[PDB]
Each structure stands twice: as C-alpha cells, then as structure tokens.
C-alpha cells in the first residue's frame, strides 16, 4: 500500500497542458483501498462517506465495485441518482435532517436513516413513514447506550422500523480493543431488544480507519481481529462500515504554481495560485496538514507560502525549508483527497480547481 | 438605519421561499452609496466586489456610476456580462495570475496595483502601457507598522518600484494603501494621507507626476455588539483631509464591507433540538460551511434574533453539518424554540456568502432581492 504520489516529471508534463491549479485523483488507488478493506474486513458492507470526496468518477468507480453510499443531504442524493445509484444503496446518516432532504429521501426511496435524538423521530415518521432507522450510540453526538432501546421503541411506535445501531470509533482512539468492546455492547443491545419485541438486523460500525502503509499500526491485522469478532458475535446480522477519509485521502494530489515571489525580508515568500479559500480550506475546517514538495535543487531557507487572494490569512506554510523558487515553478501537495475541495469556494471570483483523472492521461499508461 | 426584516416579514417570506435564504435590499445599498457621495465627495468609489458579488447589486452600482475593484478573471467576467466596461475596473490584486492578466488584457482594464518587482515584468509583458499604482504599507488602524505581511511595499521602496515600472513601459500613475478592516477611528487615514503627500511631493522632484491616489477601504459595519462610530463625522474628517493635502489629484476609495453589509439578512430555520445537555441546543440549517463562514474566515460575530417570549436560557446554536466546528453561538440568551421556527441574522451582507461551500452537498443559500417581493410594496404603503 503506497500513497498516491506524482513524480517530478509527471508534474511538469501534466502542467504543460492543464492550467494550474488542478487536482489529480488516482482511481487505481481508490480501488486498492476499497479492495483492501474487503480483503481484510469481509463482513462489513461499505457505506462510502461521500462528503469527503464527491467526485463523480470516484463515485462511479465505487458503484461499479459494489459500494453503498452515505448521504448527508438532498444534494448528495441528487448527485448519486444521476449516476444511476438507487436509494436502496443509500443511508441518510445526517443526524439532524433538513426538510428538503427528507423529501428527497422519500422520492429517491432511501432505505436506511440514522438518528440520536427523539425530536428527530417526530419528523421522520411524518416524512418517511415506515422507514428503517438505526440509532447512533456514544460508547456531543451519539446517544447514551442506556437510552438506545427506548429510542428505537419510540421510533417503532411512531411507525418506523427499528432496524439497528451505529457507533463511530474515533481515529485518535482507534484500537482493536475499542471496536471489540463496541461490538460487545452492540451484541447485548441486540439480544435485549429482541426480548423487547424488536428484531435488529443491521449494524453500522463507522469509519475511523486511517490510510498508505507509512503509518503507525498493522491495519491488515487489526481489521482481521475486528472481522473475527464480527463473525463470532454477528454471524446473521448485516454489518457496515462507512469510510470516508480512508477511501480517498491519499488518492489525490494538488499541482499549483508559484505566481509571485516576495524577497524583501529574511524570509522569502511564494504566492501560489491555490489557497485557504480553495483546496487548502482543510487547514481551517479539518485542522489538517499537507506534505508540500518543492522541486528545485540548491540550498534551502525558511520560507512562507501564500495563496492567491486579497486576504491577510491566506497563508499556508511558514518557516518551511524550501529552495529558491521562480515564477511558473510548480509545487505538489499530497494527501489532498478528503475534506479539501469539498470546502472550496469562489471567493474573490476564483474558479474551483478541477479534479483530473490520472488513469485518463498518457502519464498513467507511461507507468510500465 | 440598517436594513432589518420585520418578524411579520420573516414569516411570509419563509412561506414562499425555502430556508435558508438571504434577502438584499437594493434601496439600502443605494442609501449607503449615496451617503458616501454626500459625506466623502472627493473619494471616487471602486466597489470591492469580493464582499458581495451579487449580480443585481453590481448592476445597481454600475448604474449609479461606481467603478469596481476587481480581484480575478472571474470577477471581471461577471462585470463584463452585465455590460460594465474595463475602464471602470482596477485589477487590485497585488499578485496576479495568468488567467487574470489575459482577462484584464481582453477587457481592456486600465488600472493595476503592485507591491513587488517580480510583478512588473508580468504586467509589462501582458498589458503594456498600463496605469499602475504602487501599494504601500502604512500604520494600520491598530497602530502597527507591519512589514512582514502579505501586501504592501515599504514607503522607503515605493518610488523606486514606480520608477522601475516606468522603466518597463508602464505608466506610473499613483499610490494606494490599505489600513485594514473595521476602522473605529480616523487616525490611520489622516496619517497615511500625509505619508502619501510626501511621496507625491518627492516624486514631483524626481519628475514623475502622480495623478491618482487610492485610499483603500476599512469603513465599518455593525456587528454583534453594534457600532458606535459616527460614519458621517468619520467620513467628513477624511474628506476634509483630502482637500487640504490633495486638491489637485484624483482620489479613490475601495469600500466593500460598508457597501453591502447592512443591506443583507439571513432567514434560517431551526431544524433539530438537543435536550440532553444542561443548555438547550438548536441546529439551524445554515452553518460554518455556509454564510457563517465569516466566523472562521473574518473572525466576525453576527447579530442573531430569535422570536418568542417568556423564556430565556443560555442556549447553543449549531450548523447543519452537525460537526464539532459547526457551532455558531454558545451561552446565547434565547427563548424556547421549536423545530420549524425562524431566526434572523442581520448585517449579513459582506464576506459572508462569498466564502460559502457545498460541503455535505448543501445548497448555497440564494440571495433574494427584496424590492421584487410583495413585502416591499407593503412597506411603501
């Protein structure tokens, strides 16, 4: 498992014929990440958290491979529908659902819906009578385990089908022991519910998986421990996972050029043609950090990179060791797949940087 | 006074239009523009369209005779579509991009700003003979001379730059400066204006005759805690100064926040409730990824109005992402609200929707012209 990276020569040839900034996504890498999870965690169907990356080619690839989808809004389920994706392969997993979104959900025939609060029941019962609902469980957001069953019975009472439960394990706190303890709590709640008159049939595990193999744990071995725990505890139940960052994050790169240089201070400044109102919006909204590769040879000094807009805050990196760069030189930013261009804007009238598909280019064929 | 929708009005607008939407009063954009012609006559207006690019606003302004401060090819293209000639534009981004400079070339935009030598040859090659103004660092409204910022040459290198640009075939037209956002006092201008006199006076003796001076923006708008500047008084102190120091030169300003800020309102619905915490929690259908993005990007607090009586408890408001960052207000005194009730945010005109996104696939809240709605007619009556 390698992260998707473009070589220096690939960045130059691509930039010759696509004007910067642009993103480059690798469908091959997305597939690899999909097949990895399937190989090591076979018992979880995949609900793709498309909020992370909603690019149509990535989305089509995923429907091709069998992925279901995790929809947050009417506009998400609209994009999917034009690609031929049915609402039976959608779960509406926004906790608080818009009216416009519940309408969409009825029209498209979305099967599964999730909730943590009893104010949410009152409105799904009117909008989508008899819909299959899962409760989100905190083991902020989520619902106390001890209120989980009362919440499904309230749902069942208003004419919704109590179908099951989701938790989310945080990446920071991610461990095999953690998933194993949540599955135990889930198993108890199933058994308890059954004696309560409800047959729960579906269990949604969340995402919160990381990566590329240059990172902390042995994830293949971890998914196999979780998978073995699903097979012993939930051999008849439909199990799901909803990866988002996991699917895409290391599957996209940004190519962007130096459009100005400021040489006045001790520190050189370099203005790029993408910034915090475009793809680097991740910095503000995801609190994330993107590896930056400048390509000159020569001596390095501490250097600031700025974005292209009239705002003070359009600064991406400071005291970053980089060589001497000219205008028109190209830099490359990896880990640009998730929660980046989702947050981009046309602030200052600027265009959204397009996403180019790597497999539809000579450079991809050239890898041989 | 500021454009503020009645409660009566929020209710009927919400009947006909789905939340969230914004509501622009073109009358108010016109008062604002006129107020500035009345009290700061000597200052020609380059509307900074980044604050609000709404097409009906822009056309109003074009019709009143305003010029435009243009920041990218996309902002030029919109103006060209509305019939606005390039003579009406200044490309006032100090670091310009190739698509921008070709657009500028195509649409014959006359003016450009710059604060560095690496910009010059990029402009000479792309529009020869263009009028340039050098952008210059000055004491900000905070009283700092910050030379480590994104924009502005030091006063010390201002004239050489301008000469360096004349040496590349560009017309050395003048000087601009920006004191920054939300000026609560007139000190930064009077002080900066005087620094500018000196460079013209020093340039006369070099033999470059500078014809134009752009004084930037920074004019205030009320926020969550109001505004206590006397704008008329502030504007006349600046005007007064431009007449003693610059009797014989063309003087321009670049308002953005001021022009539209007080002309726009957001109508948004409470869509969920959380009652497990000690504070009640209200989820609205606009978030930090939408128009409230100005919390993140502009460090700004908007003034919120809930309607109802008989309660007030400190309450929390969050956005529709349902995210850790998607929190709008905490400890806000609000009555008991229910799903379906409408809230109002006022002074939502500037640096608001421009930074909004389709994250989660939500829509960009549309911007409704109030003068076309039936609620306006009621007003004239």
Residue numbers in the entry:
A (entry chain B): 1 to 139, 151 to 222, 225 to 381
B (entry chain A): 2 to 382
Would you copy out the relevant sentences from the publication that reported this structure?
In this report, we determined the crystal structures of LDC from Selenomonas ruminantium (SrLDC) in different crystallization conditions and observed that high flexibility of the PLP binding site seems to be one of the factors that lead to the low affinity for PLP in SrLDC. The monomeric form of SrLDC consists of two distinct domains, a PLP-binding barrel domain, and a sheet domain. The SrLDC homodimer is formed by a head-to-tail contact between the barrel domain of one monomer and the sheet domain of the other monomer.
To investigate the conformational changes at the active site of SrLDC, we determined its crystal structure in the apo-form with a C2 space group at 2.9 Å resolution. Unlike the two crystal forms described above, the structure contains a dimer in an asymmetric unit. Interestingly, two SrLDC monomers in the asymmetric unit exhibit completely different conformations at the active site, although no cofactor or substrate is bound in either monomer. In one monomer, the PS-loop is in the open-conformation and the R-loop is disordered. In contrast, the other monomer contains both the PS-loop and the R-loop in the closed-conformation observed in the structure of SrLDC complexed with PLP/cadaverine. Moreover, the entire AS-loop is in an ordered-conformation with a clear electron density map in this region. These observations indicate that the open-closed conformation of SrLDC is caused mainly by the different crystal packings rather than by the binding of the PLP cofactor and/or the lysine substrate. In fact, the PS-loop, the R-loop, and the AS-loop all show a much higher b-factor compared with the rest of the protein, indicating that these loop regions are highly flexible. Taken together, the results allow us to conclude that the active site of SrLDC has an extremely high flexibility.
